[PDB]
Amino acid sequence: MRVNITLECTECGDRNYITTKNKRENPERIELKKYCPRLRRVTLHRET
Amino acid sequence: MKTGIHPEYRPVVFVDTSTDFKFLSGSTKSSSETIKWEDGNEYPLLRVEISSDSHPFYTGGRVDRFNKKY
Amino acid sequence: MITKIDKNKVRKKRHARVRSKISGTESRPRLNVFRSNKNIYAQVIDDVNGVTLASASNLDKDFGSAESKVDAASKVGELVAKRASEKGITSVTFDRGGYLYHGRVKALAEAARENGLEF
Amino acid sequence: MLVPKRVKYRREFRGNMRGRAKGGTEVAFGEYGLQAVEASWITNRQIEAARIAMTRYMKRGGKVWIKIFPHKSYTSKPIGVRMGKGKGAPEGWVSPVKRGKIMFEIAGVPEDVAREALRLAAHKLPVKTKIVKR
Amino acid sequence: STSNGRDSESKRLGAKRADGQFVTGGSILYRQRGTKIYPGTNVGRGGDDTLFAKTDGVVRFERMGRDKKKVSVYPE
Amino acid sequence: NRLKDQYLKEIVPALMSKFNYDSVMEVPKIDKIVINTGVGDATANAKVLDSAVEELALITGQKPVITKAKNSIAGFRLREGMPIGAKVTLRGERMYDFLDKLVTVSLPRVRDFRGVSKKAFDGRGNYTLGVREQLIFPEIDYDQVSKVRGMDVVIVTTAKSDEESHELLTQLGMP
RNA sequence: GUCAUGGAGGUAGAGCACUGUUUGGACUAGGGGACCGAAUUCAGAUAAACUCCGAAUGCCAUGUACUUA
RNA sequence: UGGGGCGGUCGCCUCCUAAAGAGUAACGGAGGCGCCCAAAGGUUCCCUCAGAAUGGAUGGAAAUCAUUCGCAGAGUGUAAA
RNA sequence: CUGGUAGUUAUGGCGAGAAGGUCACACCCGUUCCCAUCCCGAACACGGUAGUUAAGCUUCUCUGCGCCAAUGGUAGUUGGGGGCUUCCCCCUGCGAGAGUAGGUCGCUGCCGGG
Ligand SMILES: [Mg+2]
Ligand SMILES: [Mg+2]
Ligand SMILES: [Mg+2]
Ligand SMILES: [Mg+2]
Ligand SMILES: [Mg+2]
Ligand SMILES: [Mg+2]
Ligand SMILES: [Mg+2]
Ligand SMILES: [Mg+2]
Ligand SMILES: [Mg+2]
Ligand SMILES: [Mg+2]
Ligand SMILES: [Mg+2]
Ligand SMILES: [Mg+2]
Ligand SMILES: [Mg+2]
Ligand SMILES: [Zn+2]
C-alpha cells in the first residue's frame, strides 16, 4: 500500500520533490502546487 | 430557516365532524379546500376526526353491525 | 428548568483567547472595543505600562448626530482615530475584543483605518 | 491464610527495616495489644499459627484484630541451580514489621485470659514482644 | 531464561545554563519533554520543546502562577 | 399566535395571582421541544433511518438531523459514529403550532388515555411524553407509514420547581 | 578552598489528595419470599516502577570578600 | 556466558534500579519498534470531556433524547514517561 | 456611585443571606436588511425600548467548605567518634511532613459618565 513517489514539474520536467502516499486510498496520480527552483516560481507537479 | 432544505409549510383550518370548531393551525398538508372563516387568513380547511371537544374523557363500519340486527 | 447562558462571560472567554497573541506595546498600542445594546466604545491601551492613551464613545459630548447603529460606530471610530493621531499615535494593533469582525466592529475598524491610523 | 488477590508486579525488592514504625503504634480497637520491640519479617504462616493459638484459648469469645498484612512477596531458587539467569519464582508473602508496631488486638475478655492468650501467641512469632494496655 | 534485559540510551535532559549567568543569543537553556518550564521573555520553545535564548542577556528563572515556572532573558 | 394569545391573555396573570411572584417575569414559559426517534435497532438497515427522516420532516416541517453514536459497545452490535436516532428542534412559533396540533387534534385519537402521573416528570421542571406509534399524528397516513417507533417528546419549562410546571401544563391543556 | 547571594533537580522522611494492595463497623443499589452483595461514610494501615508535600548533602553560576597555586 | 555445551540474546524507543544536576553495571524488574495519515499537515473562526441520578422507552447492565452535578475521574493514530 | 480595561501564588475561590437601579450595564420585543444553524433568529448578526430588577451585575454580613499560616517538639541528615552490625548509640551544624495558635468573603493602576 504505502509507497514512495516522486513529483515532476509539468513545464520543466524536473523531478524536484519526493513524498509518499497510500496506494489504496489514492489510486490516481496525485497533483500538488509546489515551488520550482529552476523557474523560481510556483508550478504544478505530478507523480510520475 | 435555511432555504431549500425545509419542506413546505402553511397554516390551515381544522374542522371536526362533531364540534365543527374551525380552529386555525399550521400544518404541512394542504387538505385541498378553501374557507372564508378567519378573514385575512383564509387557509384551506382540513377535515379531521374526534377532537378535544369530541372525546368523553377530554370534556364529557360499526354501523353495519347494527344494520343486520335492527 | 434551564439556566440561560451568560453572554458576557463567554465573550470574555473569547477575548482572553484573542489576547494570547495581541500585546499592546508602547510603540504599537492596543485598540480595545466594547459593544453593548445601546452603543459602542473604543480605547487605545498599552500593556507594558497599563495605561490608556486615547478614547471615544457614542455617548461622548461630540458625535451628537446619530443614525442606524453602524453610523454611530463609524463616527466613534473616526473620532478616536483623530484623537489618537493628534497625540502622535500612528501604528496600532486592533484588539477584536471577542466579537466577530463583521458588523459594528468592522465598521469602526474601517473608519479608524481610513484616517491616520495603520491598523 | 492472608494472601493478596492481585499484585501489579510479581517480583519486588527486599527493602529495609530502619527506624521506628511509621504509624499504628497505639492500640485503638481492642484493649490489649502485642507490640514488637525489635524489627523482623513475618510470613503469613506465622500469623495464621499465632491467630489460631490465640483464638483457641479464648474459646471463641471476644474479638481479635490482625493489624498487619503480608503485602510483599519473596522468591527463591532450587537446590542445584547456579547464579544468574534471572530472578526466582515467588514462594510466599511477608510483612516487614518495624519496632514499636502493635500487631495484634484483644477485646471482650478479662485480664487473665487476654494476657495468657497474648503470651501463647507471642511464642509463635520470631520477634521479641511485650503486652500493652490502652 | 530472561525476557528482560534491554533499555534505551539516556537523552541528557535538564538545565544547561544557570540562573544569573550571562548567555549568548541562540543558546539552549533547558532540554525537556513536554513543558515543565514555560518560555518567558526573550526566549522561545523549540520543535522538541527545548528552550533557547533569543537575545544576549542574563538568565532568570521566575515563577508564573502557583504550580508552574518560566525562564526569561534580560539584556545588559 | 392563537395559542400565544391564550397563554398571554389569561394564563400569565392567573399564575401571577396563584403564586404571588415578586415581579412579572418569574412566570414559567414554554421554551423548547426536542424529538428523538430512537432508531438504534437499524444497525444495518438503511431505509429505516431514512424513512424516519421523512416521517419527522413531514410531522414537523424542519429537516431532521441524524445523530451519530457517542460510544462503541459490542453488547448492542454498534460502533463509534453509527447513525442512531433523529433530532428535530422546534422553537419560536413552532412551540404553540405543534402544541395546538398535538393536544387538540393528534392527541385525542389515542386509544385509552386517562391522564399521566403528575410524578411522571423529572422532578425539576420539565416533562417527557411518549407515543407508541406514528399514526396518532394526522399528517402521516397509514399507507405511507410502514413501521412505528416509540419516540420521545420532551417539554422544556422555565419553572423553578415541579408543581407550577404541572399546573401550567394543565392550564394550557392536558397535564 | 571558604563566605554571602540566586537557581534547576523530587532522594531520605512523611502522607493518602491520584493509582494499586488492605482491616473492622454502619447502610445499601442489584438479585433473593430472611441471604450474598456493587457504590457512600466512619476509623485504621501499606507501596522501587504512588505523590497534596518534602530536607541534609551534592551541582550550576554571580561577587568587588578573604586566603591559596 | 558465575567453566563449556543445550536454552536465551545481539539494532532503536519508555519507565524502575540510579543514592533530589548530568552520567552509571548484572543471563536485574516491566513494556514497545522496523509503521501510519492526502487529512490524522498548515491557517482562520467556533467549543469542552468521563461518569452518576430522574422520565419517557420500542430498548435490558449498557444505544438515541431533556435537566441537574461534575478540574478532568475523558481524550491525545500507537508502548511508557 | 457606576461602566470599560490590566497587575498580583484563591488571604482573591465555593457556599449562604439581604439591598439596589431603566444614569450605565442586562433581561426584553422583532427578523425588512448584513449575517447564521450538520435542524432551530437558542447562539451569532441586525433593527428597536411597552415591562423588569427575577437573573446577569454592584454593594453589604459570615468561617460552613476551601485557601494561607507560625512557635515549640519530632523524623531525617553533612562532619567527627563508638557498639552486642536484620540494626543501634553519642557530640556539633542544618532541619522537615503531619497537628495547631492564628489570618481570609481581597489589595493595587488607567480611561469614560454621575
Ligand atoms: Mg530512557
Ligand atoms: Mg511542532
Ligand atoms: Mg517533528
Ligand atoms: Mg520511604
Ligand atoms: Mg546523585
Ligand atoms: Mg540523574
Ligand atoms: Mg544494563
Ligand atoms: Mg521485545
Ligand atoms: Mg438615576
Ligand atoms: Mg427575510
Ligand atoms: Mg492556594
Ligand atoms: Mg520548627
Ligand atoms: Mg510545618
Ligand atoms: Zn518548473
mmCIF file of C-alpha atoms and ligand atoms in Angstrom, chain A residues 8-14 16 34-45, ligand 14:
data_model
loop_
_atom_site.group_PDB
_atom_site.id
_atom_site.type_symbol
_atom_site.label_atom_id
_atom_site.label_comp_id
_atom_site.label_asym_id
_atom_site.label_seq_id
_atom_site.Cartn_x
_atom_site.Cartn_y
_atom_site.Cartn_z
ATOM 1 C CA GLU A 8 7.746 16.198 -11.560
ATOM 2 C CA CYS A 9 7.198 19.732 -12.826
ATOM 3 C CA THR A 10 4.763 19.906 -15.733
ATOM 4 C CA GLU A 11 6.778 22.598 -17.557
ATOM 5 C CA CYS A 12 10.463 21.908 -16.892
ATOM 6 C CA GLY A 13 10.214 18.156 -16.456
ATOM 7 C CA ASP A 14 12.500 18.101 -13.405
ATOM 8 C CA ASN A 16 12.004 18.073 -7.784
ATOM 9 C CA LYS A 34 4.950 23.312 -5.260
ATOM 10 C CA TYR A 35 7.843 25.716 -5.853
ATOM 11 C CA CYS A 36 10.128 25.023 -8.809
ATOM 12 C CA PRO A 37 13.751 26.110 -8.224
ATOM 13 C CA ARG A 38 14.661 26.368 -11.916
ATOM 14 C CA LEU A 39 11.865 28.783 -12.828
ATOM 15 C CA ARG A 40 11.837 30.388 -9.354
ATOM 16 C CA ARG A 41 8.047 30.403 -9.198
ATOM 17 C CA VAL A 42 5.216 28.060 -8.253
ATOM 18 C CA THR A 43 4.156 25.464 -10.818
ATOM 19 C CA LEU A 44 2.085 22.263 -10.866
ATOM 20 C CA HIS A 45 3.780 18.943 -10.093
HETATM 21 ZN ZN ZN J 14 9.362 24.029 -13.396
#
